[PDB]
Design a protein around this ligand. Structure first.
Ligand code: HEM
Ligand code: HEM
Lengths: 726, 726
């Protein structure tokens, strides 16, 4: 009996706010959250309580503390089969990480369509609003290893496996609506250029290095996705507050055989929100697991990540009606021109039990489609269909990776494939080929049909010669970067300029910085000049005279491209730091905590040490963390209640807490004598927008602070933070 | 797409200071630096200039930009063998990382002994002062993955492969002189407890979590290496500035057959130096590759890492003469009792060409010894002998990992082993077994003898029954942690208190924190009480009455256990930031640069933008990085020359640069009007030890700064930094 007699070693099996209880495997934290795929995993879930410790052959172990030796100070003997199994298994724990998207975090959930889409697709999972499909979703970064940090500047992966009654459909997307390159043949060049450089393997998690910008400078097709990565889209606040996209145009095929082109979207029901660069970069040091942690904790709290699936639909006859090619994955389809139709809702409501078994071994591949969907000739999508099965062979050990529990379909699967490493299923069919008579030809082919039919490709006409040639329709590189740029707010544009400037300052060969500046001058002169100024580079008269690229189908902006132009803020699931002192005014703390609770906003009570402190009325306040232990980077807002403020007024960490929160544009609220901290952040007597202050935390104080939180950050403070040494 | 006309894309093939040129593969940067191992790798080095791009089968590629398609907008065709081989290789790039020590950085070098050691060992590499042995060295952290950060708090590995004339000897050590556990049977339990927890795979690179401290609190044999890890030993400034240790007692065997017990040491000739916690932790965010980069750039600059090999020698008859067991790897041998005898010097003088081929695929294993060395019954060493060969099998793909070029011996190797995956060597021997007559029994066994003999084990007497039992002599856990504690300076003790306090504050289950504090009360009550105060824990009367453990053979302290108690500072290879303004006083900059050059200290010129600034005399100064881009974290001291100080006096980043440097105890020097920055670091006008100030920079000003840098950090400022908001 090593557990404490009070039972405090075990978290409650009930939703609890982040930090209230230790985190736990999903099936222990939320045993009653169920779906068909989670139930199907029961056959392989292993418990532990009340069982004897054994070898893998079932032999009970008596002494798991010592090797067998000749004398208690003697040599270790070869006959210790128990030691040898334990060390052998440990020595072989690791498998190869994914080639890209090696860092990621995953959860279980379920999807349901709002209405039947039988008019446009015969896909079974979109046929009935009462049909619930289990999902497993993995979010990721792209460049860094599995041990790299979460809040880097990067594209994010958003991969969803739908366990449908007609097969697994994997929608393997990212958080921006285009990709960097046009033809899969370039993918190993692009990935090699962004990954750490080959002589020394630096830098991890960063595109701020020479070979990335060298490639970009030489391949202008990259500039569109580079604009999105340099914007605040490249540093999301959470996986819950970013958009998802399939990027490619795919087809939907209905029961009559009509094809409609489709791009897929996910809309975050929590709203779009990003960090600012200095915060993101410092957070990769103070908590390199911040997004993984925040996802798991949201789920444990009941703040389930919700997303709405949407389709952009274009009829077959309108394939050539835009200024860009629908098959070019470096071009987006502006929502001003083709709106997103809402199709269904996905809720992620349970964490895995074991990260290696379920997240690390999961295998998503965009070739995994079902009847009712089909591909197009997008030349990046076409090359993807080669890569995902082959790689999963070396990563996961052989051709039976579909039998790893998390990858298994929940529907029937039968065929004539046999053997391979790690073969689990024991086939009893007398035949392993077709056609056969010895088993009456079963399992049998199934003709295509409106429901439960075999897959048939749409009969698209192909015409042309065998060529290695880029379509001329793909040779336009600057109009969509310009559309993105003109769609951003003025503070979003400043942050783009700063992304480019910071990244190019890390490029050691100055001529590459110059070449990138020249590319920027083909997109927008204001952007090029402001980056050039930060780099100490002067545009030439030729560069000042480059004519801007044309508008996209007559658009000079599209506000759906901005994170912030259209308010969509949601405070539920956010977190506020409450900076305590050793005699807090309990009235302020009751008002603050209960207002946050009512809006589903979490609180962390911080102090200069761990333990407890005692409020004015004798209430015992438990401390979650110290000021340095849970820095302002990890919260959305900071509130300082009244009490004995002299206790913390000269505490450097408490003062810095506010200076850092202030620099990073977060709302700050100061009650009572906590308003003495106004001097630390240089706030004027009459106050300023973004700082809430009053004599007590009562009346409208918490409503004002929550209004600031719904707007995410205090953009109007940006000119004010430029000075301030923090 | 070519190179710039001026040749500025290619680094000069001569030693240059960090940042002066882009870094490059070692064979290109230093083509004249040779040793027998580096030359032997010439068979597999692949150039590139002037060569055609080809497939791996030698077919020249005409178009490496496009997949083969049926029409330029059509589907990709299966018959594109060029696309398929490029994508297939890419899809299989990754191999499993090492189970532990996955994050590491390596270089080539050479070793030679100071004098023949033939009276104590017959090992050929120690037999002649003019016989040089090539080495390859990898330094590592322990817990984090290969993409995790460098300046985490962790033990560091220090593994050296010696390519001797009588076989490869791998000395696989760490940077503290003991390990956490006594018997290899517990290694998978310990490693699992420190590694990310299994449900959610958090946290990376950190022991600051429940499972690690649960294990420590239940296994007090861990407390000695925990003390080391919580001290500033856990956060080295560079791999150049830490000690190494083989940990285990091994044997030396001379030509007469006499065995002497030995422990191995490496002494850094650059001296011992560590970061401070807040600096280390923020640097994991601002530069997660800091130690890898620093090592590479020291070798490029000619600041070659040098280390002295040292042996603590104990005769066989003195095995039981201490109050601890020599075979217990949780016990150190104090140098007050057994001096370290200097044996030789190692110099690392060339970087690899390709990180994956040389660093990632290197295989070190402590079972790789040579005649003249032998093992002992240390029960941790005994179990390591099982694990290194077996793991290198799944990691490196098969039993022929010795034929991977970095792992090959440079001496002859011939035997009857055959086949296995990726077999390179083509054996011509008609026999693959012995004894054989058909090849006259070649290759033949070789009797042992004084030189060039076959390996024979020392004939140690073994007497005991077959037991799984820990030796009673190993059951003492508190005396060595106490000796360590008492040998640290008062500031180093403060940092150990802070390291335990910070870590246990992140343990969510409070009882585990209480159980660790109870263990600390068995080591030293001052330590226990200082940690308990930061955790809001009160010691019980019983805990206040625990009797301290005994002294270690009469010692009350051993100063060789401290990083700083005995001055050993060497400024060559350190780096200063120079904060420029737009009209630098060129006389100051002249004096600064001349004094730094004389001592081998590098400079980095920083400003608020990139490009160039011009000094008062017309000198054009290229800017290495912005104040934000290369923070104070990355330098050893900060100097601010005069000039137009108004240009930077109100820059928030410039002021914060000094505040962070001040909080981190770094020397700061201010000339002329730069003294106005004294106000931001909120202290004295008469001056303060640690801040060098004068009307101009010159001989006396630079001398004073350089003396500060030789002492590493300004420990006297510690009490003044808790008030600074930084
Ligand atoms: C629209 C462009 C692309 C998007 C949105 C995309 C998305 C993703 C995502 C989200 C993952 C990680 C799935 C996971 O969480 O396990 C992934 C993995 C991968 N991608 Fe793609 N990708 C794209 C382009 C490509 C191209 C052109 C290729 C190669 C031809 C490729 C090869 C791979 C490979 C090798 C993996 C690792 C898969 C595995 O080990 O399971 N990707 N990609
Ligand atoms: C004194 C205690 C120990 C020290 C000093 C030690 C040192 C190290 C070092 C420095 C490396 C990294 C070598 C490299 O750079 O590639 C390493 C790797 C390894 N160690 Fe140890 N270790 C110790 C105990 C153990 C134990 C008790 C075991 C297992 C029984 C063990 C198993 C491993 C394995 C599996 C690797 C990965 C090796 C590879 O993939 O090539 N270590 N160790």
């Amino acid at each position: 009996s090593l557990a404490p007699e009070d039972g405090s070693h075990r978290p409650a099996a009930e939703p609890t706010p982040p930090g209230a209880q230790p985190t736990a495997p999903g099936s222990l934290k939320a045993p009653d959250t169920r779906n068909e795929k989670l139930n199907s995993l029961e056959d392989v879930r292993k418990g532990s309580e009340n069982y004897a410790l054994t070898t893998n052959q079932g032999v009970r172990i008596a002494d798991d503390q010592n090797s067998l030796r000749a004398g208690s100070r003697g040599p270790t003997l070869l006959e210790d089969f128990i030691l040898r199994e334990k060390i052998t298994h440990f020595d072989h724990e690791r498998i190869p990480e994914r080639i890209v998207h090696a860092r990621g975090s995953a959860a279980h959930g379920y999807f349901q369509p709002y209405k039947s889409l039988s008019d446009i697709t015969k896909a079974d999972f979109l046929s009935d609003p009462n049909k619930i499909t289990p999902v497993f979703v993995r979010f990721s970064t792209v460049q860094g290893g599995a041990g790299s940090a979460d809040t880097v500047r990067d594209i994010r992966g958003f991969a969803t496996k739908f366990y449908t009654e007609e097969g697994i459909f994997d929608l393997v997307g990212n958080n921006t609506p285009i990709f960097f390159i046009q033809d899969a043949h370039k993918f190993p060049d692009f990935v090699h250029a962004v990954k750490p450089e080959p002589h020394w393997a630096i830098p991890q998690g960063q595109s701020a290095h020479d070979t990335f910008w060298d490639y970009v400078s030489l391949q202008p097709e990259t500039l569109h996705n580079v604009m999105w990565a340099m914007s605040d889209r490249g540093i999301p606040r959470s996986y819950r507050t970013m958009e998802g996209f399939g990027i490619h145009t795919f087809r939907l095929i209905n029961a009559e055989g009509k094809a409609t082109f489709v791009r897929f979207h996910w809309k975050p029901l929590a709203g779009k929100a990003s960090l600012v660069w200095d915060e993101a970069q410092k957070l990769t040091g103070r908590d390199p697991d911040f997004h993984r942690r925040e996802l798991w904790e949201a789920i444990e709290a009941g703040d389930f990540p919700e997303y709405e699936l949407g389709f952009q639909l274009i009829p077959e006859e309108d394939e050539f009606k835009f200024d860009f090619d629908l098959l070019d994955p470096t071009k987006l389809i502006p929502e001003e021109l083709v709106p997103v139709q809402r199709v269904g809702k996905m809720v992620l409501n349970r964490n895995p039990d074991n990260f290696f078994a379920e997240n690390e071994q999961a295998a998503f591949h965009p070739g995994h489609i079902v009847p009712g969907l089909d591909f197009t000739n997008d030349p990046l999508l076409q090359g993807r269909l080669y890569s995902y099965t082959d790689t999963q062979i070396s990563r996961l050990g052989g051709p039976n990776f579909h039998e790893i529990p998390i990858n298994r379909p929940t529907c029937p699967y039968h065929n004539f494939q046999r053997d391979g490493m790690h073969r689990m299923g024991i086939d009893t069919n007398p035949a392993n080929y077709e056609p056969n008579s010895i088993n009456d030809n079963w399992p049998r082919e199934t003709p295509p049909g409106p429901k439960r039919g075999g897959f048939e490709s749409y009969q698209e006409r192909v015409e042309g010669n065998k060529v290695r040639e880029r379509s001329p329709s793909f040779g336009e590189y600057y109009s969509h970067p310009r559309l993105f740029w003109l769609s951003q707010t003025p503070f979003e544009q400043r942050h783009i300029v700063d992304g480019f400037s910071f990244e190019l300052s890390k490029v050691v060969r100055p001529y590459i910085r110059e070449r990138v500046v020249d590319q920027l001058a083909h997109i927008d002169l204001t952007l090029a000049q402001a980056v050039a100024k930060n780099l100490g580079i002067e545009l030439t008269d030729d560069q000042l005279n480059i004519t801007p690229p044309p508008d996209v189908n007559g658009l000079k902006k599209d506000p759906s491209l901005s994170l912030y132009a259209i308010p969509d803020g949601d405070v539920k699931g956010r977190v506020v730091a409450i900076l305590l002192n050793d005699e807090v005014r309990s009235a302020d703390l009751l008002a603050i905590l209960k207002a946050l609770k009512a809006k589903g906003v979490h609180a962390k009570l911080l102090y200069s040490r761990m333990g407890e402190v005692t409020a004015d009325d004798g209430t015992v306040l438990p401390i979650a963390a110290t000021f340095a232990g849970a820095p302002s980077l990890t919260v959305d807002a900071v509130i300082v209640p009244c009490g004995n403020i002299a206790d913390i007024a000269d505490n450097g960490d408490a003062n810095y807490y506010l200076m850092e929160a202030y620099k990073h544009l977060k709302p700050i609220a100061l009650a009572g004598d906590a308003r003495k901290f106004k001097a630390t952040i240089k706030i004027a007597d009459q106050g300023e927008e973004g700082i809430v202050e009053a004599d007590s935390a009562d009346g409208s104080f918490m409503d004002e602070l929550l209004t600031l939180m719904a707007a995410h950050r205090v953009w109007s403070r940006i000119p004010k933070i430029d000075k301030i040494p923090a």
